Amino acid sequence: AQSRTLLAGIVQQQQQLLDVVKRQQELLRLTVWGTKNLQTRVTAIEKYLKDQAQLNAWGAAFRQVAHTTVPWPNASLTPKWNNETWQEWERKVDFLEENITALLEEAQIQQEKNMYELQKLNS
Amino acid sequence: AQSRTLLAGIVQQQQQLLDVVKRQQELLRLTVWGTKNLQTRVTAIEKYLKDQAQLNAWGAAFRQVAHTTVPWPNASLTPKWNNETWQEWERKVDFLEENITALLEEAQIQQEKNMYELQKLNS
Amino acid sequence: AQSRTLLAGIVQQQQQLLDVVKRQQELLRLTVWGTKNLQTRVTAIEKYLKDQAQLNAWGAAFRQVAHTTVPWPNASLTPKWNNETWQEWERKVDFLEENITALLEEAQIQQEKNMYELQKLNS
């Protein structure tokens, strides 16, 4: 009189939900890559912006033996606020990812044990 | 003859899935911070780009009492399309976050009630 | 003697978890839009950076009939590495999204069948 068939569907449904949850984590990693890739491009752009400061006046002297170079800062380089804040941001993600793996690992073990118990009822 | 042990595992498994789901929301917030932080840096870069337009020709005159300044636009500032579209983007997230909290709140209450019912069977 | 009420809560709880999971996918799409929108702005900024290279020296000649134009590259345009890598990044998301829809579709069908079975016990 036990509803094993209903439980098999419920137990199976939990597995499908677990897979989508794990799948979301993989998708999240791809999004993180896009953001980080933009930062690498940003580092190159600031370097180029500095070159623009070097460009000031070409041939601005035809009766003098001197050239005026005005390399005024262009890209504001972040020394501590972004690096310290970004490292903390990445670190929070690292602890959160480790926590999700722990719950997924226990869920996988528990998931197999729950199904095994169902078999024991009518093994 | 009831499979309370199997149900305890199934009920417990749902709680573990709920935690990972809530955990994903926290991780998502960290990703949003990285994107928003880049925008703050972008606002500073456009300001610097405007300064580059000001740089045009230094000392390009040694027999005249005048200086040619050509501050031609450099960074295209967004007045309505990004602000109106970005506000809508943030607003959609705000309604979605509120909807997730409602489902999590009901799940927590329902989760405790489901376990309490299991205790009533053999309390 | 069956715990249908407990199962109804467990079955209902799974539906609530499924909704939040689907809700996370919608939220993820909004985050992807923010990242892609920044790239469109970046494409415009590189074009503006090229214009800065054109600006070199205005009026740097008052006794000559010539102008010195030095349009040295400014923004490093990505021809193959970002496009090929970004297309692969978007493609991975496309396969992952299709996989999530398949699991959600099966879960919806299975979810309705699990509830229908509960009704059959006492229909």
TrEMBL record, chains A, B, C:
<protein>
    <recommendedName>
        <fullName>Envelope glycoprotein gp160</fullName>
    </recommendedName>
</protein>
<comment type="subunit">
    <text>The mature envelope protein (Env) consists of a homotrimer of non-covalently associated gp120-gp41 heterodimers. The resulting complex protrudes from the virus surface as a spike.</text>
</comment>
<feature type="coiled-coil region">
    <location>
        <begin position="86"/>
        <end position="113"/>
    </location>
</feature>
<feature type="domain" description="Retroviral envelope protein GP41-like">
    <location>
        <begin position="1"/>
        <end position="123"/>
    </location>
</feature>
